[PDB]
Paper text:
A third structure (gly-3) was resolved in the α1emβem GlyR–glycine complex that corresponds to the desensitized state. Two out of five orthosteric sites had densities of glycine. However, due to the lower overall resolution (~4.1 Å), we did not explicitly model glycine, instead only indicated these two positions in Fig. 2j. The activation gate around 9’ Leu is open. The desensitization gate is constricted to a radius of ~2 Å (m pink), rendering the channel non-conductive. α1β GlyR in the apo and gly-3(desensitized) states, but not in the gly-1/2(open/expanded-open) states, retained 5-fold pseudosymmetry, despite that the ECD remains largely symmetric throughout the gating cycle. In this way, the pore is dilated in an asymmetrical manner, representing one possible open state of α1β GlyR. When desensitization happens, the intracellular end of M2 helices of all subunits collapses back into a more pseudo-symmetrical conformation that is thermodynamically stable, stopping Cl− conduction. We also note that limitations in resolution, especially in the gly-3(desensitized) state, might complicate the precise assignment of occupied sites. Nonetheless, the same compact conformation was observed across all five pockets, irrespective of whether glycine is bound.
Here we report near-atomic resolution structures resolved in digitonin consistent with all principle functional states of the human α1β GlyR, which is a major Cys-loop receptor that mediates inhibitory neurotransmission in the central nervous system of adults. On the contrary, the heteromeric GlyRs containing both the α and the β subunit are found throughout the central nervous system. In all the structures determined, either with or without glycine, 4 α1 subunits and 1 β subunit were identified, consistent with the recent discovery of 4:1 α2:β stoichiometry of human α2β GlyR and heteromeric GlyR purified from porcine tissue. However, due to the distinct characteristics of the α and β subunit transmembrane domains (TMD), symmetric activation in ECD resulted in asymmetric structural rearrangements in the TMD, leading to asymmetric pore dilation that is distinct from homomeric GlyRs.
Residue numbers in the entry:
A (entry chain E): 33 to 334, 446 to 475
B (entry chain D): 8 to 311, 384 to 419
C (entry chain C): 8 to 310, 386 to 419
D (entry chain B): 8 to 309, 384 to 419
E (entry chain A): 8 to 309, 387 to 419
The structure:
Amino acid sequence: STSNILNRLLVSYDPRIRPNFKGIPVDVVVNIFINSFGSIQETTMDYRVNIFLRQKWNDPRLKLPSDFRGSDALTVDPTMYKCLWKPDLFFANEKSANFHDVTQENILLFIFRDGDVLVSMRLSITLSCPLDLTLFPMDTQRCKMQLESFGYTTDDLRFIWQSGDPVQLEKIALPQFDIKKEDIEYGNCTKYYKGTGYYTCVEVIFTLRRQVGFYMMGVYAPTLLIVVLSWLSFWINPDASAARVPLGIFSVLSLASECTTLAAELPKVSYVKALDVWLIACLLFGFASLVEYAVVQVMLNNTAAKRIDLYARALFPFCFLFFNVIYWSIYL
Amino acid sequence: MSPSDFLDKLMGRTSGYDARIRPNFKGPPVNVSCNIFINSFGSIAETTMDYRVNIFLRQQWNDPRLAYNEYPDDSLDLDPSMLDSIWKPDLFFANEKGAHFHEITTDNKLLRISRNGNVLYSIRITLTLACPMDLKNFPMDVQTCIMQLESFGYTMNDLIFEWQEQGAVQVADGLTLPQFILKEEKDLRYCTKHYNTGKFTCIEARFHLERQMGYYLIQMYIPSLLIVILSWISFWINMDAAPARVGLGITTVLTMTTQSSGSRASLPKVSYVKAIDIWMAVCLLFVFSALLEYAAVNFVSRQHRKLFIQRAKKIDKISRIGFPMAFLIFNMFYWIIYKI
Amino acid sequence: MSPSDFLDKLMGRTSGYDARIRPNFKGPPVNVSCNIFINSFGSIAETTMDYRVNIFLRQQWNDPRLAYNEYPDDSLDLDPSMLDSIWKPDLFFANEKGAHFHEITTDNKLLRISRNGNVLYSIRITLTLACPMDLKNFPMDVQTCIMQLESFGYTMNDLIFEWQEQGAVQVADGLTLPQFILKEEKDLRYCTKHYNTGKFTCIEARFHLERQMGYYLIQMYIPSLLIVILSWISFWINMDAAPARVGLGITTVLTMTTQSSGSRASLPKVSYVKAIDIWMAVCLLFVFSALLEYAAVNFVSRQLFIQRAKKIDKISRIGFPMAFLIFNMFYWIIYKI
Amino acid sequence: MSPSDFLDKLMGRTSGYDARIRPNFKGPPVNVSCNIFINSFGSIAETTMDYRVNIFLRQQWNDPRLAYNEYPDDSLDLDPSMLDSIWKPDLFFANEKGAHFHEITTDNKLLRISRNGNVLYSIRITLTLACPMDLKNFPMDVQTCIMQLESFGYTMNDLIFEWQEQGAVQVADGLTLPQFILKEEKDLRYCTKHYNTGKFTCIEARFHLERQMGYYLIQMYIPSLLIVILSWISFWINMDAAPARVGLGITTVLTMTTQSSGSRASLPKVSYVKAIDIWMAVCLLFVFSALLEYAAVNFVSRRKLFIQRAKKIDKISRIGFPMAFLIFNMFYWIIYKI
Amino acid sequence: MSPSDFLDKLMGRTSGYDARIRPNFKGPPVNVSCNIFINSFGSIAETTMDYRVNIFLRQQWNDPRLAYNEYPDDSLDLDPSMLDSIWKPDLFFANEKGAHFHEITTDNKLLRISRNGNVLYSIRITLTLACPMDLKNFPMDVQTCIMQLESFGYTMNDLIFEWQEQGAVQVADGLTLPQFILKEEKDLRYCTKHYNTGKFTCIEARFHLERQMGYYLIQMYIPSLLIVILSWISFWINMDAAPARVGLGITTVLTMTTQSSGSRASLPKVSYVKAIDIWMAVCLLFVFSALLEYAAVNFVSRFIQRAKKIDKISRIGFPMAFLIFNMFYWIIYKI
Ligand SMILES: *[C@@H]1O[C@H](CO)[C@@H](O)[C@H](O)[C@H]1NC(C)=O
Ligand SMILES: *[C@@H]1O[C@H](CO)[C@@H](O)[C@H](O)[C@H]1NC(C)=O
Ligand SMILES: *[C@@H]1O[C@H](CO)[C@@H](O)[C@H](O)[C@H]1NC(C)=O
Ligand SMILES: *[C@@H]1O[C@H](CO)[C@@H](O)[C@H](O)[C@H]1NC(C)=O
Ligand SMILES: *[C@@H]1O[C@H](CO)[C@@H](O)[C@H](O)[C@H]1NC(C)=O
Ligand SMILES: CCCCCCCCC
Ligand SMILES: CCCCCCCC
Ligand SMILES: CCCCCC
Ligand SMILES: CCCCCC
Ligand SMILES: CCCCCC
Ligand SMILES: CCCCCC
Ligand SMILES: CCCCCC
Ligand SMILES: CCCCCC
Ligand SMILES: CCCCCC
Ligand SMILES: CCCCCC
Ligand SMILES: CCCCCC
Ligand SMILES: CCCCC
């Protein structure tokens, strides 16, 4: 039959022993597919990726004999894959992950003439990457995906990045960010754990630069509206006091409430943020409007305060203009 | 004559049938016809770019090693306990984002045998597939999510997938969706793609879905017109006591901003402008124009006779006669343009 | 004589009985009468169109191959570990949407064997069934949440389920429901449906659920008429405090808007018009009319005139409560069909 | 002599012991006394009518087939690997709403063997119990949550459950609960019941649990006190400042409506009246009446003789209302603290 | 010579080594050496009053039945798939609230054999420890969470645990924590407790945790100061028209109420008074005194010199009291 060759290959074969155990460390290469790069969540400091992991390594015991056909490639099923030897591999920054068994476990086997074999196990991942949340609206995040063996050591097993596709899919269509360059630097992250020695590593980063649209259109326009209402407050008669003060204090209340609500959405970082300082500048501008009107009223009650009021309403708008200009210039 | 012995001699230990061998090895590919049956949609929310479905799944193919000529009857079923004992295809969904089985009181899987040698195997599974939501015309949205079906451990030079031409994607009758609806026409094409390791068969099935306007229509568009009429009556209010109209305009602005913020949260974070944020922004700019018009008429009133007060009344009535017409015609453009 | 030997010779290797073949093969169908026992209802939701039940499930059928004549006693029980060694039905739930077993210290399974060959099998499972929730008259709603039971891998010409007539759906006493009570009478009809591969036996039990008015009634009806009478007392204010009156009116409009928004956000999005939404709309219309006619009376007062304005104000004061009361009476009579 | 040989001859292949047959088969019922060791409460929430516990569990019985006389020492510990090779009860929890083991580094299960054949079996499990909560006097709530412990496939004639009365509900020392402290008393009775398949044993324990008002005192009553004092300062203002006084009135009403809505969010939707809600609603009616009386006195103000009467009425209200609120507060607290 | 024959003759079927019996049976206990190595903290949340860590876990002991003298190399690894062929301890966690393994492409388990007879066995585990969280001085809090590593099915006289001295709890270098930085110093003590069924070995590892002020500092104290200076500018207004001053006071008290409501959404419900809440209460009392003072001066007006004098005295004295209380509170909760 056709299964006789594989059955004879597996009999008298020990999967408990890695190939060339007394020889040189075995050579492994990787081609990490990127199928569905899921949405990233700042509050969890995590993101989800769906990959088609691929590995290749020489295996002299797995040499397909030319007696049957001498096939360039041979294919068997996941049961045979479980029967054969496998290279162990755990994701370093992994925190929750599983397999896929929609009908059965997804494994592909290609067996070469030389003895090199190819396996591929699709497996969904949720990674962890410490976000540099500073300069939040203008950031280029570096979330890293790395592989390394656990049981075996560098003198026993090694990893190399194959000179091939690390990026794959072109129709990624990520919701928020976008990926242009996928360069591999700090590729070898050869890691030492005390009492164990050297462990081979292969590492890759994904460079994701956030766009601006949502934040630009969701917050900045309301801030500008609050500021222009404050400017109109500057353009009101100081004589009235039951209208100018209430609208200004309402504006500062609304601005502060919006600031608190928006600040509560991001993860509770422990240092200043660009959006934070933007909201702070807007809030102090509103408070400046209120205090200048109060001062105008105080001076009016027992020089004229009208000249001061018109000077303020003519000067501070330009102040806000070039202040936000400086803000955008310094953050870009 | 023992029924169990026929099963053993057909497949299993005392048969020579190696389940690790696909039918017709080292020869032509296998056609493997398949057809699905929806049972219940649901939990389709834009927050996660996905939807949950519960479907059946049946494969049809002919196995010469499974061909038999001992039972006089044509049809033949089998206990689901032996499903792993024979070869099965490796059908899998490219976009998965979570899937599982149903293991209630049994493994609810069905297999049937045809007299000639063709086989029928069915299984029910639950999927949560990623739906690439596009939110351009969100209130009037039209959206399709494709269920990628393909093989993994077999190149298309050896395994092929095809649909039954007669109702491959037949659907249940009583199903319904929350504020959505799926149209009857459902396209069916191919998706056979390539990889650095080879190429595999890939069949495709896509749906066309609509969302009923009613919910969003009422719940968000009603307050907009309410605030428009409130600004109109603010215009109708005379100008002697400033704080009255000042507070009315301030409250209208509060309504607009809070309603926009509330509309924002449910819809997922997106960069490109949506279809109803434009409504919210334009209503916000009308109320801003209302308060600015009041500020202008107040400035004209107190700049200092009543000749300019006559002009202030004239511009007040001009606004009162212009904003209704402008708002109506703008609504006509807005509604017409997104319905085409 | 030995119970272990007796069990092995009854079913297992040394029995000649194969668990993989349905009883009375190539003969009459198998009935397998089944009854269910509610043990904990509740955790019902509406945003996801489902409810969770933790129920028992007891099947009854007769297998002639299992007939024994050794033990004098009629009733006999077995270790649940023996269960996987004998034939089982493939009963599943159509509208399933997630369910699982319970493995606490044992797979909670009971097996009993009758002398003639009748067998009783039970299992405790927890389900999350999908219910076509309808919310036309949402505060005064009555719902029919259903469970469809059917086989999967057997045509109905080989297998057809029934229910024991003597209280097939017996229900525990201590169970109670938040914002719900189930009715004692429970309908029971058939649901036999067809598919492309044939037709399978389908059975179902439907439940009627009634939601108490109390919670919604108090907590969201009361602020409505509270603000309505706030507007009513706002009418009694005279023209001098026009900014005060307009501010309080617009703030009442704010209160109605935010209460309505909360009420809508509590309940999942639906296209067809609900019931209480007309209540929020009508209260918003009444407060809007109050503010509108206050503005109109101020305008006519600025533009003889005072007496007519006072007359229309008192007409409104005597009319608005009457219209509100007749509207409430109409609403309550029309939503008790 | 060999421990492996002794284990094989006691249970397993060369022992003649079948784990599928209960001790004293076709005879007297078996006694299974068990005790529950509490290790951690927590995550008790009213939103889903439940509480989560992580407890130990030890059963006690004496299978005559397990008797042995080889090792002189009475005690005998075993690897939980052998656990599947002996008979077990079918113990389960009625109202448990899904639970699981702990598979961390091993299956954390202990089995002990006594010289006479007595066997101790222990297993650590974590539960999520469904507690039929009652929330009538919820601010001062006192609760009775249970855990119905019962067998499943064995009737009166086959299996019984009792308690090791000496510390049956032995609880950990340093544990405590957020917004909860449990009393040392633990009641103990039987849920014994029947079904159409027969009758099964019960044992259960109920834990008296009460919620201390501290956090609820601060977050709930203090803001209401502040708003109502704002209402009396609204009284304290004159009549000519009509927009100011009335704006204070409606804004306090806004505070009240938002506070009433916020408190309702945490608790589940219950038809029957709660205890905090009446407080919030009645002092809401207080501030509403404040605005009502200010409007009424404005109407009275709008030849000049009635102004003095209006001022006198304002003084009477400003005096009486604090007294009414205080006497009502004492009345309500004495009702719901008894 | 043959690796398969060597493994079979060492452990398994044709070895006589039973995996159901602990080493040195009916003899001295196994001393055992166990150490941990952090890989990542994260998810310190007071809402659930627990936290999740991702750590390795290593044990050391000597099994006499595992003694071998064939392979010249001292250190020797083995296939993880044959872990179950040999005995292992039952090291579990006391308060753990549910975990799992990592099964990615293999059970990520490492086994090492020493020539003399020592064995190394390591498994990567992800925990979720319940911490007795305290919130008395919440913004300036110092936290100490513990992990009670111990055995379950073996008495103390039969089995004891111990720590390897050199860097027992060594941590990763570059890890960082939101809202937290752990100090380098970690204590180590025994927790050998008792039960009615006996007594067991028990070990502890406690982490000191300090939470940075920054987030709460800015997002809570800055708006409070803004509202206090809103109250100041309310004082600065003339008495004349009541509505402006009264409305400003109302807006400020609404800000206090809203901030007090929103502050506690993240923090868990706790009976004892917190530290931030007293700040909220005192600033609410400051603005309350401001509004009450304006009501009193309005009553006095409807003596104008006395009213303006007391207004000025309040305007000058209130900031002094605010500053002295501010300094007092900060020294109290900073020393
Ligand atoms: C890592 O090291 C191996 C050999 O030590 C080498 O073949 C490989 O190119 C290196 N990879 C990187 C990214 O430096
Ligand atoms: C169907 O299968 C037959 C035999 O395997 C093959 O000759 C034929 O080309 C297949 N059809 C397609 C469309 O691949
Ligand atoms: C099932 O019961 C019904 C009772 O009318 C009847 O068809 C027959 O007794 C049973 N059918 C079988 C055993 O196929
Ligand atoms: C314990 O002994 C037997 C066990 O079958 C039982 O009849 C008895 O009621 C039990 N309880 C006692 C003796 O208190
Ligand atoms: C192991 O046993 C105890 C417990 O740690 C310890 O004191 C002793 O020194 C160790 N060695 C021996 C031989 O007992
Ligand atoms: C489901 C339709 C209800 C319509 C109610 C109309 C009430 C008019 C007063
Ligand atoms: C070191 C930062 C102190 C806080 C600054 C806040 C600025 C608004
Ligand atoms: C790209 C930003 C558009 C904003 C429209 C209001
Ligand atoms: C269906 C067409 C509606 C047009 C409204 C202006
Ligand atoms: C169907 C669209 C209706 C729009 C009414 C203003
Ligand atoms: C049962 C509802 C009664 C309502 C009376 C106004
Ligand atoms: C124990 C109850 C105390 C209540 C104090 C107001
Ligand atoms: C029990 C809490 C008291 C708080 C006093 C400020
Ligand atoms: C870090 C807090 C500083 C406070 C100074 C008043
Ligand atoms: C004024 C604040 C000083 C704080 C010193 C720690
Ligand atoms: C914990 C000290 C509080 C002091 C309040 C004046
Ligand atoms: C379809 C909602 C009602 C419109 C008047």
